[PDB]
Amino acid sequence: KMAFTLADRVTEEMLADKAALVVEVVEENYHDAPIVGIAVVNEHGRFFLRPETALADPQFVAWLGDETKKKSMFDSKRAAVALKWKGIELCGVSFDLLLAAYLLDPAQGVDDVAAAAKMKQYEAVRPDEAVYGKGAKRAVPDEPVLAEHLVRKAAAIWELERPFLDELRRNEQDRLLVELEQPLSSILAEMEFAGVKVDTKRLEQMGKELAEQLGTVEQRIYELAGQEFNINSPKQLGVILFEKLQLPVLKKTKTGYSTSADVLEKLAPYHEIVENILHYRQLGKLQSTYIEGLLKVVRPATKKVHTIFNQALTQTGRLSSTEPNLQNIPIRLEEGRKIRQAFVPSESDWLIFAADYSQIELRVLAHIAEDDNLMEAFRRDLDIHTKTAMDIFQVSEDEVTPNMRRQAKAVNFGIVYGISDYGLAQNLNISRKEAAEFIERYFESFPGVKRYMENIVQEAKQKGYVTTLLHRRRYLPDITSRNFNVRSFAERMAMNTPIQGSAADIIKKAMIDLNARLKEERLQAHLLLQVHDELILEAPKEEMERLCRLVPEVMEQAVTLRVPLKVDYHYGSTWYDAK
DNA sequence: GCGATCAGCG
DNA sequence: ACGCTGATCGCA
Ligand SMILES: [Ca+2]
């Protein structure tokens, strides 16, 4: 039905200075994936190009790389990274419909052009699932069907830029889109394509030793149970723990007994088997997720892994990382933390450099709540996580172990995000009356934080949503629910989303400023990863001293709050050693 | 496919 | 009965 030119070659009217562009990559993981077709829509008409001709045409390649030739797209990072794997640079992306829809409403779950278009009553385009199919039936349709679908997606983007930009402007989000999310998308594309080199010899050797240790722990388990059984079957595990050994039942799931790590730690005084089970799960988690799982996604020729940073997924404005997830590599236990020895620089005589914001969300909270005592604490550069551990465990600063500080950390965030006295009691193995009175003492020291929690909930009720410092938005319809439990979850979102989301705004701006500064200084240093409030770079070892001065300062000056921001940083031969 | 579990970030 | 995630695994 929709008219377009099925081109056999590239003509000049296809190369206008504004166009909607579709560069179609059907595989979910777009690294090194086929480009199946290209569509262009501009003032001169609608065009479909086969990639084998468009991407070898020197005028089309120059047009793609000309930043003054402006393109509107959906998920331009998918396109940009797929084009890098074809050796082609995409520049000039001035509107991204995926990122525009994400800002307007992250809960929509927009995953293709049709779902974005539906937000503005535009329905002249089919969902990608209807054209390609689902699961094992996924297939590229034949050329006529493929080309009409790509042209319809391009025409939708063409028509939708203005009504999306208009609503972004009304929401105070247009500069958020155009100066933050869209430049960040090109930086993530570079990070994803650079990848992270992995020491596969050391990883495989760890995997060998691990399997030997797994079998040993597994036999002490069978010997402590007096019998063999399946350690990962809840049924058989419940029989050993709760019927055979007759341990107390502290917690049930919807399917039966709970055996989560918090339950098993509480059972450790009763029987030695439960701590062996914990060691066994931890060893097994490393093997399946961080050894085997990681080797499966290493590209063998370069020994690099290439994550995908989902930039339009989380409800707070955070990124997520997938296949592999490089944002949850073990660190807390020494056995798992050794995994990070396998992440190495991509050139000899380069180093890994890591920089991290200190107590980022509490500094953001101090600023947003304008709490006098919390603002003073950070103006003194106090370590609030350590101070809370001193108070909890009634020890001195010199005696705070890494674990107590990590514990107190869950206490600080738990309290400001609405933990109940019950929840706090369970978390610390203390009484519920002592839990409630600790919480009341905590808000007596920080009355501005308490006022803020009450006020933000009220504002969410009035407005129907909450916002972050850079005007990211999250709608909270459940805030006025008749159901107490549904309303309560919404109130804790109203307490947490402005703080976590503002911390996400800040590090994103820091990344944009960092990239610009590295380029102005003509350094080879470049970002590899973001881990929510941490940035990880690699660079020639001769740039490290300049990075020690440049990176902390760029991150600390990304925004100006009522308290200082503070950055810790380390560098070394591996990711393990950058700490 | 989902729920439980557990790895990270706060 | 703090929040935000992704990968794995058994299936009660
Ligand atoms: Ca931090």
CA of A435 to the centre of ligand 1 (A): 26
Contact by Cβ (8 Å): A553, A568:
no
Q: Can you tell me the distance from the alpha carbon of A324 to that of A196, in angstroms, rounded to the nearest whole number? A: 11
Q: Can you tell me the distance from the alpha carbon of A420 to that of A492, in angstroms, rounded to the nearest whole number? A: 11
Helix (H, G, I), strand (E, B) or coil at A425: helix
Distance of A327 CA from C6 C1′ (whole Å):
9
CATH 3.30.420.10 is held by the domain A5-194? yes
Q: Can you tell me the distance from the alpha carbon of A498 to that of A364, in angstroms, rounded to the nearest whole number? A: 9
What CATH architecture does domain A200-302 belong to? Up-down Bundle (1.20)
Dihedral angle over CA of A278, A281, A285, A288, nearest 10: 160
Helix (H, G, I), strand (E, B) or coil at A446: coil
Distance of A475 CA from C2 C1′ (whole Å):
19
Where in chain A are the domains? 5-194, 200-302, 361-500
Distance of A359 CA from B9 C1′ (whole Å):
11
Q: Can you tell me the distance from the alpha carbon of A273 to that of A177, in angstroms, rounded to the nearest whole number? A: 53
Give CA separation, A347 vs A193, A334, A570, in Å. 15, 27, 19
Q: Can you tell me the distance from the alpha carbon of A490 to that of A414, in angstroms, rounded to the nearest whole number? A: 16
Residue nearest to nucleotide C11 (CA to C1'): A233
Helix (H, G, I), strand (E, B) or coil at A195: coil
CA of A567 to the centre of ligand 1 (A): 8
Q: How was this structure determined?
A: X-ray
DSSP conformation letters of A368-380: HHT-HHHHHHHHT
Taking alpha carbons only, the member of A265, A232, A267 closest to residue A247 is A267
DSSP conformation letters of A456-500: HHHHHHHHSEEE-TT--EEE-GGGG-SSHHHHHHHHHHHHHHHHH
**A251 annotated binding-site participant:** no
CA of A189 to the centre of ligand 1 (A): 24
Positive or negative CA dihedral for A229, A231, A233, A237? positive
Helix (H, G, I), strand (E, B) or coil at A521: coil
Q: Can you tell me the distance from the alpha carbon of A527 to that of A103, in angstroms, rounded to the nearest whole number? A: 24
CA of A172 to the centre of ligand 1 (A): 29
Q: Can you tell me the distance from the alpha carbon of A464 to that of A475, in angstroms, rounded to the nearest whole number? A: 6
Taking alpha carbons only, the member of A196, A193, A22 closest to residue A96 is A22
Contact by Cβ (8 Å): A408, A401:
no
Q: Can you tell me the distance from the alpha carbon of A200 to that of A343, in angstroms, rounded to the nearest whole number? A: 9
Q: Can you tell me the distance from the alpha carbon of A359 to that of A382, in angstroms, rounded to the nearest whole number? A: 10
Degrees, nearest 5: CA angle A71-A509-A159: 25
List chain C nucleotides near protein: any atom < 7 Å from a Cβ: 1-12
A147 CB-contact burial (10 Å; exposed 0-12 / middle 13-18 / buried 19+): buried
Resolution to 1 decimal place, in Å? 2.2
Contact by Cβ (8 Å): A329, A548:
no
Which residues are CB-neighbours of A254 under 8 A, at least 6 positions away? none
Give the single-character DSSP code of A68: T
Dihedral angle over CA of A486, A489, A490, A493, nearest 10: -170
Distance of A289 CA from C7 C1′ (whole Å):
6
Tell how far CA A124 is from the center of its chain: 33
Residue with tokens 């209807």: A130
A1 is written with which tokens? 């039905």
| Angle formed by the axes of helices A484-520 and A544-556, nearest 10° | 140
Helix (H, G, I), strand (E, B) or coil at A91: coil
Contact by Cβ (8 Å): A374, A362:
yes
Contact by Cβ (8 Å): A255, A307:
no
Residue nearest to nucleotide C5 (CA to C1'): A320
CA of A361 to the centre of ligand 1 (A): 9
Q: Can you tell me the distance from the alpha carbon of A545 to that of A552, in angstroms, rounded to the nearest whole number? A: 12
Q: Can you tell me the distance from the alpha carbon of A536 to that of A281, in angstroms, rounded to the nearest whole number? A: 29
Residue nearest to nucleotide B9 (CA to C1'): A532
Degrees, nearest 5: CA angle A51-A54-A55: 75
Q: Can you tell me the distance from the alpha carbon of A272 to that of A280, in angstroms, rounded to the nearest whole number? A: 13
Taking alpha carbons only, the member of A238, A246, A244, A334 closest to residue A277 is A238
Helix (H, G, I), strand (E, B) or coil at A58: helix
State which H helix or E strand residue A349 sits in: none
Q: Which nucleotide is nearest to A359 (CA to C1')?
A: B10
Q: Can you tell me the distance from the alpha carbon of A536 to that of A530, in angstroms, rounded to the nearest whole number? A: 6
Which residues are CB-neighbours of A212 under 8 A, at least 6 positions away? none
From the candidate CATH numbers 3.40.50.740, 3.30.465.10, 3.30.70.20, 1.10.150.20, the one assigned to the domain spanning A361-500: 1.10.150.20
Q: Which nucleotide is nearest to A500 (CA to C1')?
A: B10
Residues at Cβ < 5 Å from ligand 1 ion = A 356, 533
CB atoms within 10 A of CB A402: 9
Contact by Cβ (8 Å): A304, A196:
yes
- The CB-side HSE value for A336 (13 A sphere, CA atoms) comes to 18
CA of A534 to the centre of ligand 1 (A): 7
What does the radius of gyration of chain A's CA atoms come to, in whole angstroms?
Answer: 26
Q: Can you tell me the distance from the alpha carbon of A551 to that of A353, in angstroms, rounded to the nearest whole number? A: 9
Strands A18-24 and A70-73: parallel
Contact by Cβ (8 Å): A19, A28:
no
Tell how far CA A284 is from the center of its chain: 24
Taking alpha carbons only, the member of A326, A70, A297, A298 closest to residue A191 is A326
Contact by Cβ (8 Å): A199, A130:
no
Contact by Cβ (8 Å): A425, A407:
no
